[PDB]
């Protein structure tokens, strides 16, 4: 299974996207972070061209537990970079599962030519197996 970390010139920090920054969002007050319910937000809240129909339930102040990768919007349209140049799920409709599952076409853009699909490999598989197996001589010989 070959995959590319989903970097995207369209994703931004959750907090950069919030319109009304509240104490609960910024403060990072523990008392709150441990007793609030999950938060429903949409891809629109994470990518500029994010689909608002894709809703996700994240854990409070999770944006304070991890930072996202960054790609200057300039690479956004240069063919040849394996970045997601379009918010995930942009062409699958308001459907979460379809956004989460990797859409291989999302990468067609950056390859000179898939004469051998997108990836390919060759290897030697050395397998040794002990087992009860009469010799070929025994099989072909009757008596």
């Amino acid at each position: 299974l070959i995959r590319f970390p989903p970097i995207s010139p369209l994703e931004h920090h959750y907090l950069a996207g919030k319109s009304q920054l509240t104490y609960t969002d910024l403060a990072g007050d523990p008392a709150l972070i441990g007793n609030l319910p999950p938060r429903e937000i949409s891809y629109r809240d994470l990518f500029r061209d994010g689909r608002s129909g894709i809703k996700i339930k994240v854990a409070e102040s999770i944006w304070y537990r991890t930072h996202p990768d960054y790609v200057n919007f300039k690479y956004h349209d240069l063919h040849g970079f394996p970045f997601l140049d379009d918010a995930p799920g942009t062409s699958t409709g308001d459907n979460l599962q379809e956004a989460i599952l990797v859409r291989h076409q999302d990468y067609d853009a950056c390859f000179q030519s898939q004469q051998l699909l997108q990836w390919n490999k060759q290897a030697r598989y050395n397998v040794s197996v002990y087992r009860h197996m009469p010799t070929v001589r025994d099989s072909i010989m009757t008596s």
């Binding site: 299974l1 970390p5 970097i7 999770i62 537990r65 991890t66 990768d69």
Partner: peptide
């Protein structure tokens, strides 16, 4: 420029993703 090509692992710290079970 070895690490710079590969997105970090975020292995340090506690568990962040609960998704119902094991997902590769």
């Amino acid at each position: 420029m070895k690490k710079a090509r590969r997105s970090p692992s975020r292995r340090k710290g506690a568990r962040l993703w609960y998704v119902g079970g094991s997902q590769f």
